[PDB]
Amino acid sequence: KVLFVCIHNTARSVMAEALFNAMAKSWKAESAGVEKAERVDETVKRLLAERGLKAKEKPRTVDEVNLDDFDLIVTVCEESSCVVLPTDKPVTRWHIENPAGKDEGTYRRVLAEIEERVKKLVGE
Amino acid sequence: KVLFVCIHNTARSVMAEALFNAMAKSWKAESAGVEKAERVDETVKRLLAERGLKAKEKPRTVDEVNLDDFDLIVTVCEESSCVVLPTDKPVTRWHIENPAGKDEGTYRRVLAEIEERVKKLVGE
Amino acid sequence: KVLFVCIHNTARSVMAEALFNAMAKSWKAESAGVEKAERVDETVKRLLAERGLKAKEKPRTVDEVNLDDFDLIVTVCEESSCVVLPTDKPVTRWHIENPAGKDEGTYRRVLAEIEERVKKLVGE
Amino acid sequence: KVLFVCIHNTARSVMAEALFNAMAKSWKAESAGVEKAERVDETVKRLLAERGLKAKEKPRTVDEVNLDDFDLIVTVCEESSCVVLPTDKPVTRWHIENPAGKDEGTYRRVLAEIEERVKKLVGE
Secondary structure, three states: OEEEEEOOOOOHHHHHHHHHHOOOOOOOEEEEEOOOOOOOOHHHHHHHHOOOOOOOOOOOEHHHOOHHHOOOEEEEEOOOOOEOOOOOOOEEEEEOOOOOOOOOOHHHHHHHHHHHHHHHHOOO | OEEEEEOOOOOHHHHHHHHHHHHOOOOOEEEEEOOOOOOOOHHHHHHHHOOOOOOOOOOOEHHHOOHHHOOEEEEEEOOOOOEOOOOOOOEEEEEOOOOOOOOOOHHHHHHHHHHHHHHHHOOO | OEEEEEOOOOOHHHHHHHHHHHHOOOOOEEEEEOOOOOOOOHHHHHHHHOOOOOOOOOOOEHHHOOHHHOOEEEEEEOOOOOEOOOOOOOEEEEEOOOOOOOOOOHHHHHHHHHHHHHHHHOOO | OEEEEEOOOOOHHHHHHHHHHHHOOOOOEEEEEOOOOOOOOHHHHHHHHOOOOOOOOOOOEHHHOOHHHOOEEEEEEOOOOOEOOOOOOOEEEEEOOOOOOOOOOHHHHHHHHHHHHHHHHOOO
């Protein structure tokens, strides 16, 4: 399995997970965040449900998760601030626009990029 | 000058700046964050005002700031997720408990640590 | 393809490459180093040739190589000094004893670990 | 004190140290390397002795050194491979041409840059 981690873990983290799982046959996916959050984005769960996908029930901080369990932790970084995690394990970095607040169609645009990237990533 | 950067930039980032400036003679300080935030913590501005300190007017993302201007960017990291910045410049990491939400006296405890660390840091 | 990079690129880097290729069906491998080196270790080429493997002809610095070509750059780090490369791409870290100088059977022990790790890594 | 660490620790690491010490009043300096080396460069000790400076007696790997002792570890990185050390402490990165082998006057050129940088760095 792979781990999609972003900062607040409410949208992107959750999007990549759901899309990954709908495309991967053997690999599975989970998500985590650097900081706490109460709810998963409503725009996201709507957008995923519109695609027949259920987002994660509740954001889970990366602290409540033992990283070594994963075999590829993909990190969804900001425009210029990729967070590093405590693992000599394999980890990539995806610079993806933060849809938060922007709402509107920007979320869908973010969804698509994540999809183009997950699709490509699911090559292996 | 030094730059105190944390994720959301609402409390700690702001605390260290204000305390630093009240202790440093020649050096000055600024703060920035990895992600957007509308307001500076009310507990903080209260806590600083109680010490005769005005917190920053509004959180400024590290994106609206050209890092090279600084000479020591101290990064206030989480329990296990120190964010890295785009600079071959000097940067440290302070693992400081996130007071957010916890409110109560936890904030003051966080204030004290930041103070113990800023005081020490102001050695140079 | 995967890229095995170490500092001087004379032994381990070269070992992992040759073993990987002898085990991977679809993926291929290459190697590179942080600093220049004139010759590939004689102990290694002997040790690989003893296993029917030809080591790389000459060490190639990671500078003479465009990283983006690869899809997983595994970094063979020291006891406490994992070098980071200029890529938002996926990269792991293997703490492997430096056989250099130690010669004797230590090289073979290093060969075995790299093999245990490559074998495992070739899972995907 | 500050710590100047490079890969092999034979030239640059040693140059910065000696120059630093000849310029700093209160701060002191030491050097360390990522990998073992038997001798300190002869071009360097000549070059420093020509300036009335004695280079380090023998290269000391960063492993034989407890990092926390220092208060600013400057890392002399390559064209594209800055090594990271095991410390949440403050550390910078200097991209300095590797004089090794090039010999000739290139060493002096490297000496000068390090000097321009140490001079500047000794501001604090």
